[PDB]
């Protein structure tokens, strides 16, 4: 059968944490990095570490074009540890209201990156571990981990062309 949703949940933690680290580094000559970002669940050369890295690279030009608008919108929302679960949940639910596709799955990683970075840079709170759980649990509970598993896991995102 397919890999389990539990396996995809583990893989998602690895993809997200790698993604966050490599995304911050590619944006650093444009925000302090949360020191927790250098702690990964596994070595970064693992398969899921490579997937996270490649997804960060693929999105670079897209994410740069939307930075100013997202920065303004998050400054207005003022996410903190006290409201981040509510805002993450509502935004993620709306992102997936029409169904699942790989762009939305990868965009959820990007939103998690921006949310964690804002809470740290502006809220002075390290919240990366918590946002990691928000992302993993959201995917588990809204059938996304299952959808991923049934397509062969996260490596599928890099193999659609």
């Amino acid at each position: 059968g397919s890999m389990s949703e539990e396996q995809v949940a583990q893989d998602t933690e690895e993809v997200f944490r790698s993604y966050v680290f490599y995304r911050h580094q590619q944006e650093q000559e444009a925000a302090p990095a949360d020191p927790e970002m250098v702690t990964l669940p596994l070595q970064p050369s693992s398969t899921m570490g490579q997937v996270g890295r490649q997804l960060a690279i693929i999105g670079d030009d897209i994410n740069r074009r939307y930075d100013s608008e997202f920065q303004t919108m998050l400054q207005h929302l003022q996410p903190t540890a006290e409201n981040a679960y509510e805002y993450f949940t509502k935004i993620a639910t709306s992102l997936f209201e029409s169904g699942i596709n790989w762009g939305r799955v990868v965009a959820l990683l990007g939103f998690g990156y921006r949310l964690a970075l804002h809470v740290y840079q502006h809220g002075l709170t390290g919240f990366l571990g918590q946002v990691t759980r928000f992302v993993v649990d959201f995917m588990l509970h809204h059938s996304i981990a299952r959808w991923i598993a049934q397509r062969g896991g996260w490596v599928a995102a890099l193999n659609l062309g």
């Binding site: 999105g59 997202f70 998050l74 929302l77 596709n101 762009g103 939305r104 965009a107 990007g110």
Partner: peptide
């Protein structure tokens, strides 16, 4: 309402990512 505006922007980014991945 403002949540919806942010989600709308993420949905736009997602379609750009999807196109690039495909």
């Amino acid at each position: 309402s403002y949540i919806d505006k942010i989600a709308d922007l993420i949905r736009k980014v997602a379609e750009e990512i999807n196109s690039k991945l495909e």
